[PDB]
Amino acid sequence: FSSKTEWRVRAISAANLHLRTNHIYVSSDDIKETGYTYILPKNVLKKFICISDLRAQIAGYLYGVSPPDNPQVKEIRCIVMVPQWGTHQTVHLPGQLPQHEYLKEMEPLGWIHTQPNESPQLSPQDVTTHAKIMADNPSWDGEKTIIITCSFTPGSCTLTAYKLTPSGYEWGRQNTDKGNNPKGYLPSHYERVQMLLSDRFLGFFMVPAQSSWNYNFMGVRHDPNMKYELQLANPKEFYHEVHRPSHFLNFALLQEGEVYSADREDLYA
């Protein structure tokens, strides 16, 4: 990235992200009709979209449960934001999976990440990331976990949910190429699951304890094997001050300043 004025223009653009949060579209097609249904609370959805950014992709883990006497549906009741940095086509999450007392009761259901532009197909990077996560962690069930993509269409956010088929799981686990068009990536590796929004309950967030989540301005400090402890709070915005300590710290102190300064008494104080 340019890192000189590109970030400034992107911050100016991202300041208006709360406008997108009222034109939301859901893709309801190709649904197999046999798998689970998923219900996402609009409060956490709006918070995620607001804290997101146009170009860089952000991602967060979903935790949820099934409502009593209705197991074929899953309500998403928590989102976890973890130390991460992402490019315009991938997100570099840490190896450590989230772990906390409150999360001990819910069941991981996958992850949700942004997309700078819409693509009618799940990307090879997304499928391989999900496959790697599932393989490394036995907790992720290949039938319950999904991936939710929020693509920034003109003045709107389009949400679509995808499930990983066993063929996709095997291909992702065996794969190593990180390019845009890896060999053996087929449209039979994933299938679309039914998701919908709901105003009838509220989810919450969980962020890291010691530091913040975003690392795009502190990438050199982001180690995939880094160990972090969770905390119950709300996430900051993408361009928050704490997320870019570089800009706010690299100034210089005052040495023999204010010497020739204008003499104006603070009469009121």
Binding site: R8, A11, I12, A15, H18, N43, K47, R77, Y102, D199, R200, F201, L202, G203, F204, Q210, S211, L232, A233, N234, E237, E241, V242, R244, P245, H247, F248, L249, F251, A252, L253, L254, G257, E258, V259, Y260, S261, A262, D263, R264, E265, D266, L267, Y268, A269
Partner: protein
């Protein structure tokens, strides 16, 4: 009639520079001559006025001795002082002393201060500081900072504390409290008064000295205008005299100045032309003529050189320039000029000593520029260089070594070092406010010229003034007593009208016009209509200018309404304060700016938009981007971290970059740019604080967090991502930046050791200091405990524990925090409040209880944050989780009031019964109509929940009549929570039943011996829960208590409050009896409308049909409630501010009908009565509250003992408090009932035993001070409900009105808790022990299973299944309920066993013991008997026995009020016995002192005597307990002593 004016046209554009005289006539010898490209006009040294034949300079020894000590080293007074000392010291009139600058006006001010000081002498001592306060209003901050020191030196002999007004509001108020002489600027005083910080000492402010009052002509003149106008007004209404001393320069319109100051032209007016100046000054004016500024500047330089060479070897020179850098520039330039011309030695001729002193001081100097200039006769003096260097320059000039000093007006203002010659160069200054180059101010010029001519050495000053030819006339008129003072009030009329409305001094256009009449604008407009846009036609049409004042007020109100600061109605011409207006008044922000904020701010703003909104403020409307600085502006744009949406070529972007640069601590180069930076920062402080207040009061969590962070960040001048240690200015920048480089979360350092942190930073030497500072950093620990109160409200108790070593030098007297309770998304605040942590109460827990609403989709959690108000990175957050929260079910609807026809008395059966109701009312109220068919014709248990004042006593009477019909030998027992109400009902039913139906009614007292006989004899037994329990505890033995036929309990809704558990246990025991004794003891319960009425009805056996629970809006007379928020954290300030709203509400709602005002404490009653009387007298409607005439008051006024009460009652208002005797209480009550007095101010504690009803009920400050915790505790909702229900006048009033003036914190709480029924919960668990020992001795409890069975009967069990969270339960499951019951019963039994009152065998069987027997017999607390048993030995005596009894635990409820400590200490030294380590806050030591005083039969205060009577009530039983325990132990001498 009203007409809109054009204020911006009416104003004078030039402001301070505006002139009022079109001509300028000079003295005789005032020639002029055009020399070259400039005109020199000379004016000579006016000869002194010859001394009067009978006038001389009296020595200080002729002045009063109390005035001598203020004059140290002064043998004779100046001419003006010797002329007017008589008036300044021997009289208290308003003075207007017009004298030239430098003549010694401070000495006359000192004379007036000495007069005030000597008014109170403290003959045996020296002075009584705490009886008066004197204000010295000096315009310039440096002048104030010098005057404070000079006055301190002068009056140090008196011990008088002289100090300046500076710092935050709290710091300023504390300083005002501490000191006696307050030195301040007009703006500082005005802002403090607007915020109300000085309302506690306005009365003690007995004298104000307005120094250099001619500022009125200046653009700052409106500040003085409003200050004096408001002072004179308040003097007029409140009628307390404050002496005004206006010191002015000799200038025209001084007669108008005297009129405005209320200064008598004959006595209080004085005029001393420039002739009287102690050192006459020859004044030269060089007006440059050329029209090219470069040549103007060159000619200016040449002219200053010419004049310095003119006075080179003769006299010392003080050159005055504008800028700090310009001072050095001109000094060096003149040095080089005279060096080139070879005239450098004319200043430093071979004066070996002086020149060598100069050279050596140069070699020692650190400042390089001054070191360069000092070897020669030149020096510089500006505020931008070291204190040591500037004092060095000053003392060198005093020694007369430096021959020329170049400086700015700062020296002339803050230091009195006159010189023979003064030379003003240019008079040009860059004002960022006007954002351009403008001429010097009149005050500046007069002051800097006052330095011309040292009185000690110099006989004739020489003042040269180099200006523009066009500007010349202005300064000529200025210095030749020819520039009349003219008000600029038209410019700032709207803001000041808003400030007055906010203060409340003005309410409608009429009061606004009255206030405007007192403004200096009014007199000037009257005298010179043409100068103020008025025609002689308008003047003749309106001789008093009432029409013009009304038009001005109308236009100002129109603009205030357009900007929404005030809600103004053109119909009635009234004003209402809006939060925007209050913020504008508090922070002196223009109305256009507040409108801009109200229009721009939105909840979702980002930090990028925040800066733009701030920079769009109208206070910077003048500021504009000048392309000369645009390259540097672009550089700053690139450097600053926060993006800028706008382009660099916009003033908004300029302000944005300037503020970001100041925060970033960067260094700028342009003079104009850096001046603009300073200006914008100083304004931005207040602007950002105001924006923060707006967003907070509107409830936007994200935005308010941003804004508070930004205010703190501006104040500390550092970004919040930096290391917080920088906030300690003493820490080395090297180590702070090293820490910042080693970026880790700051909290990490807390857990580490000093060596550990030193090694982490790799700087062991500072490691210890870093440990010190990180431990000094403020830090709080939060602990939450929440209980659901209803389905839509929780109660959260939050405990705060400090974790930082307090230190005044860095923390101060107090640390302020904001507590914010916000929802799951942290986007809306649900409860925001202040929290002051004082040093006195540090390192100890603070309890903060509050109620927060809960909505339908139960959120997972709420967030409680505590954020420091000053410090950066000082926050603590806590998530409260609604994960295990069980919400109590939704209560059923209240029993609707069926529209039955009126019930005629003929519906009743017996003629004797009807007799006592026939004349009082032919029909009963609909409530009694509804309830009669069940109370009288049916025998089942009955409940009646109706609003207070609906006549539930009538239903009780119906129940008793039905019982009597059943049998004349039946017995009713009527239990009332409070003894006063018990006495009321005793009187009522003694007059009703016994005197007409010949039935016996007996009231039980605290004596079982007579209580048993009265129960056996009488037929209606009135009792209080404790007096009934002392009997029912032995119901198995007592057959009389068993054979009863009616149990009536009045107001069981008081079950949840204190002393409620006793009532609960007696009710449960009576139910259990009725169950066991073969005959249903019918029970009739009366209460206020209860939401959870079903629970109590089920507990009492009432049938669903027989539960009558109505709604608060079912009262026969409707109520109108009004809650007034008063967001004033400080309790005394809030109380005082409530004084005027009381009168306002009385006028608005109940102008002619009775009003009762409930006050928190015993002392406030008299003050509130006096204040209402004072405001009514200020209004023309004096004695308007005396519905009768004085003729009918003498017979009752002659019985009272309080002279103040007599005066108030004569004026038309009475009051009532515990201090008053019951006789006076009854007299005032009867007067109010008759209507002789409209207003009665009653103490809070008298709300219950109060036998009258009024039409209006005001309640002020629903909190009372508990000194045990040293905190203000809220009124119990039961007491508030009683006080509002007191507004029940059945026939006289169509409606009853009540207004509660409460903090915004309690506003919503009361709104929720007063319009709805009142859920009630039990507090039995905390007080089970006493009743449990009672039951075990009674043998009702024999095993723990029987204990659980007994618990199954109480109310607590009934609620333990509906609201489990209230009782620490986790589920309604039988398992959880059984576990909790077993735990609590086992805990209580184990505690009793440890106390040895009971014995537990097999861990399942329980038996009593001897100490428990004594405790149950004499009704003592088990812990009290325990303490008695352990502390009492065989050798104890009365001297220690009194201490033991005082330590008895029954007295722990004795009240501890404010101001109760000093008189208790005074008592402590006079009782025969001394107390060891006495903490007067302790109930036991207080009761010991009270018992000693009672034994000594010494005089006591009324409240102290009441507490003594309460003590003696139980002292007898405690001493019988002592006798019995000593008998059991077998100690003859201790028993004898007992």
């Amino acid at each position: 009639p009203r007409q809109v004016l054009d204020l911006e046209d009416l104003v004078f554009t030039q402001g301070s520079h505006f002139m009022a005289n079109k001509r300028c006539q000079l003295p005789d010898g005032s020639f002029r001559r055009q020399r070259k490209g400039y005109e020199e006009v000379h004016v000579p040294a006016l000869k002194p006025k010859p001394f009067g034949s009978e006038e001389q300079l009296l020595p200080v020894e002729k002045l009063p001795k109390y005035a001598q000590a203020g004059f140290e080293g002064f043998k004779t007074l100046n001419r003006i002082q010797s002329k007017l000392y008589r008036a300044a010291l021997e009289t208290d009139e308003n003075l207007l002393l017009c004298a030239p600058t430098g003549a010694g006006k401070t000495n006359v001010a000192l004379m007036c201060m000495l007069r005030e000081i000597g008014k109170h002498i403290n003959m045996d001592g020296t002075i009584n500081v705490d009886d008066f306060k004197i204000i010295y209003i000096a315009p310039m901050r440096s002048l104030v900072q010098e005057m404070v020191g000079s006055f301190g030196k002068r009056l140090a002999t008196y011990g008088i504390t002289v100090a300046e007004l500076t710092g935050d509001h709290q710091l300023c108020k504390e300083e005002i409290s501490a000191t006696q002489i307050i030195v301040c600027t007009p703006e500082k005083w005005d802002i403090i008064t607007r915020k109300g910080g000085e309302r506690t000492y306005t009365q003690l402010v007995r004298l104000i000295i307005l120094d250099e009052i001619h500022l009125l002509h200046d653009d700052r003149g409106p500040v003085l205008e409003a200050l004096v106008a408001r002072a004179i007004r308040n003097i007029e209404m409140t009628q307390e005299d404050v002496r005004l001393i206006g010191l002015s320069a000799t200038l025209p319109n001084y007669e108008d100045v005297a009129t405005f100051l209320r200064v008598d032209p004959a006595k209080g007016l004085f005029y001393f032309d420039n002739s009287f100046r102690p050192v006459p000054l020859e004044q030269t004016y060089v007006g440059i003529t050329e029209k090219k500024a470069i040549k103007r500047f060159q000619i200016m330089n040449e002219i200053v050189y010419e004049k310095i060479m003119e006075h080179a070897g003769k006299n010392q020179v003080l050159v005055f320039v504008h800028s700090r850098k310009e001072t050095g520039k001109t000094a060096r330039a003149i040095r080089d000029m005279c060096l080139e011309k070879d005239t450098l030695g004319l200043f430093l001729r071979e004066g070996s000593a002086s020149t060598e002193v100069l050279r050596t001081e140069a070699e020692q100097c650190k400042n390089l520029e001054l070191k360069d200039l000092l070897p020669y006769g030149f020096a510089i003096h500006h505020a931008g260089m070291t204190r040591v260097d500037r004092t060095l320059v000053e003392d060198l000039f005093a020694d007369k070594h430096i021959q020329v000093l170049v400086s700015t007006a700062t020296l002339a203002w803050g230091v009195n070092l006159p010189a023979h010659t003064v030379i003003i160069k240019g008079t040009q200054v860059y004002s960022p406010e006007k954002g351009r180059w403008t001429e010097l101010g009149a005050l500046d010029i007069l002051q800097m010229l006052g330095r011309a001519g040292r009185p000690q050495y110099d006989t004739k000053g020489e003042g040269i003034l180099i200006t523009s030819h066009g500007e010349l006339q202005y300064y000529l008129s200025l210095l030749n007593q020819q520039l009349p003072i003219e008000s600029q009030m038209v410019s700032k009329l709207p803001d000041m009208l808003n400030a007055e409305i906010v203060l409340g001094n003005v309410q409608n256009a009429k009061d606004a016009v009255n206030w405007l009449g007192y403004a200096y604008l009014y007199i000037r407009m009257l005298r010179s209509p043409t100068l103020y846009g008025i025609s002689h036609d308008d003047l003749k049409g309106d001789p008093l200018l009432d029409q013009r004042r009304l038009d001005l007020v109308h236009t100002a109100a129109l603009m205030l309404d357009k900007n929404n600061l005030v809600k103004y109605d053109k119909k009635t011409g009234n004003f209402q304060v809006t939060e925007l207006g209050r913020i504008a008044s508090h922070y002196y922000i223009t109305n256009d700016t507040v409108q801009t904020y109200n229009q721009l701010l939105k909840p979702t703003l980002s930090e990028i938009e925040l800066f733009r909104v701030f920079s769009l403020s109208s206070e910077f409307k003048n500021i504009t981007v000048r392309e000369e600085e645009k390259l540097e502006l672009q550089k700053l744009l690139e450097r600053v971290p926060i993006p800028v949406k706008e382009s660099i070529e916009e003033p908004s972007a300029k302000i944005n970059v300037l503020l970001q640069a100041f925060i970033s601590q960067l260094k700028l180069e342009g003079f104009a740019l850096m001046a603009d930076m300073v200006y914008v920062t100083q304004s931005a402080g207040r602007l950002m604080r105001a924006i923060f207040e707006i967003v907070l009061n509107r409830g936007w969590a994200q935005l308010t967090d941003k804004t508070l962070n930004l205010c703190k960040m501006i104040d500390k001048r550092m970004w919040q991502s930096m290391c917080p240690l920088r906030q300690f200015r003493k820490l080395p920048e090297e180590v702070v930046k090293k820490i910042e480089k080693k970026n880790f979360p700051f909290e990490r350092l807390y857990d580490l050791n000093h060596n550990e942190i030193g090694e982490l930073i790799r700087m062991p030497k500072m490691g210890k200091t870093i440990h010190k500072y990180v431990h000094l950093f403020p830090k709080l620990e939060l602990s939450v405990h929440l209980q659901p109160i209803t389905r839509s409200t929780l109660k959260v108790e939050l405990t705060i524990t400090p974790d930082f070593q307090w230190d005044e030098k860095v923390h101060g007297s107090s640390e302020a925090f904001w507590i914010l309770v916000e929802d799951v998304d942290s986007e809306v605040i649900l409860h925001h409040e202040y929290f002051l942590l004082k040093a006195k109460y540090a390192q100890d827990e603070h309890l903060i209880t509050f109620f927060v609403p809960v909505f339908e989709p139960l959120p997972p959690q709420y967030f409680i944050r505590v954020v420091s108000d000053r410090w950066l990175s000082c926050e603590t957050q806590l998530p409260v989780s609604f994960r295990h929260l069980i919400l109590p079910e939704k209560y059923p609807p209240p029993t609707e009031l069926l529209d039955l026809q009126p019930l005629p008395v003929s519906a009743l059966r017996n003629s004797a019964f009807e007799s006592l109701y026939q004349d009082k009312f032919p029909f009963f109220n609909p409530i009694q109509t509804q309830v009669f068919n069940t109370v009288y014709n049916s025998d089942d248990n009955v409940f009646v929940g109706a609003p207070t004042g609906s006549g539930k006593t009538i239903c009780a009477e119906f129940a008793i009549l039905r019982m009597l019909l059943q049998s004349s030998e039946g017995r009713c027992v009527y239990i009332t929570p409070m003894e006063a109400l018990a006495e009321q009902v005793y009187m009522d039913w003694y007059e009703k039943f016994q005197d007409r139906l010949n039935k016996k009614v007996v009231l039980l007292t605290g004596e079982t011996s007579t209580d048993l006989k009265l129960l056996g004899k009488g037929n209606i037994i009135i009792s209080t829960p404790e007096k009934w329990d002392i009997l029912s505890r032995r119901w198995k033995q007592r057959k009389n208590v068993q054979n009863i036929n009616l149990f009536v309990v009045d107001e069981v809704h008081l079950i949840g409050g204190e002393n409620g558990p006793v009532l609960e246990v007696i009710c449960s025991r009576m139910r259990y009896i009725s169950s066991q004794i073969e005959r249903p003891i019918r029970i009739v319960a009366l209460s206020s409308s209860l939401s959870n009425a079903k629970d109590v009805a089920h507990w009492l056996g009432c049938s669903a049909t027989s539960t009558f629970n109505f709604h608060p809006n079912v009262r026969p007379v409707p109520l109108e409630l009004h809650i007034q928020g008063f967001n004033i954290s400080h309790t005394q300030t809030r109380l005082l501010s409530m004084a005027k709203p009381v009168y306002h509400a009385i006028t608005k709602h109940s102008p002619k009908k009775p009003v009762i005002v409930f006050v928190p404490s015993r002392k406030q009653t008299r003050l509130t009565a006096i204040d209402i009387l004072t405001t009514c007298a200020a209004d023309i409607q004096r004695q308007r509250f005396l519905h009768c005439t004085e003729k009918d008051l003498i017979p009752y006024l002659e019985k009272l003992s309080d002279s103040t009460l007599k005066e108030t009652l004569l004026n038309g208002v009475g009051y009532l408090h515990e201090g008053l005797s019951p006789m006076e209480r009854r007299l005032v009550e009867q007067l109010f009932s008759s209507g002789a007095i409209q207003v009665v101010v009653a103490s809070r504690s008298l709300c219950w035993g109060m036998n009258v009803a009024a039409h209006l009920v005001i309640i002020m400050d629903t909190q009372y001070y508990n000194g045990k915790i040293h905190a203000y505790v809220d009124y119990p909702i039961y007491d508030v409900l009683q006080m509002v229900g007191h507004a029940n006048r059945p026939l006289q009033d169509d409606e009853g009105r009540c207004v509660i003036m409460c903090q915004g914190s309690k506003k919503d709480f009361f709104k929720k808790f007063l319009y709805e029924p009142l859920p009630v919960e039990s507090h039995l668990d905390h007080c089970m022990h006493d009743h449990f020992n009672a039951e075990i001795v009674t043998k009702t409890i024999e095993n723990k299973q029987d204990a659980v069975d007994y618990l199954t009967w109480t109310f607590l069990y009934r609620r333990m299944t509906q609201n489990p969270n209230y009782y620490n339960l986790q589920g309604i499951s039988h398992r959880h309920l059984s576990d909790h019951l077993s735990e609590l019963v086992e805990q209580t039994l184990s505690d009793l066993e440890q106390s040895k009152c009971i014995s537990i065998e097999d861990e399942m069987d329980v038996a009593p013991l001897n100490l428990g027997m004594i405790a149950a017999y004499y009704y003592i607390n088990y812990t009290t008997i325990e303490l008695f048993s352990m502390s009492l030995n065989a050798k104890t005596k009365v001297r220690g026995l009194i201490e033991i009894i005082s330590n008895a635990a029954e007295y722990e409820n004795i009240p501890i009020r404010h101001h109760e400590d000093n008189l208790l200490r005074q008592l402590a030294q006079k009782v025969p016995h001394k107390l060891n380590n006495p903490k007067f806050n302790d109930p036991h030591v207080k009761t010991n002192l009270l018992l000693q005083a009672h034994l000594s039969r010494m005089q006591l205060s009324a409240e102290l005597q009441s507490d003594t009577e309460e003590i003696l009530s139980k002292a007898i039983r405690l001493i019988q307990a002592c006798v019995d325990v000593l008998s059991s132990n077998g100690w003859l001498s201790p028993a004898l002593a007992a």
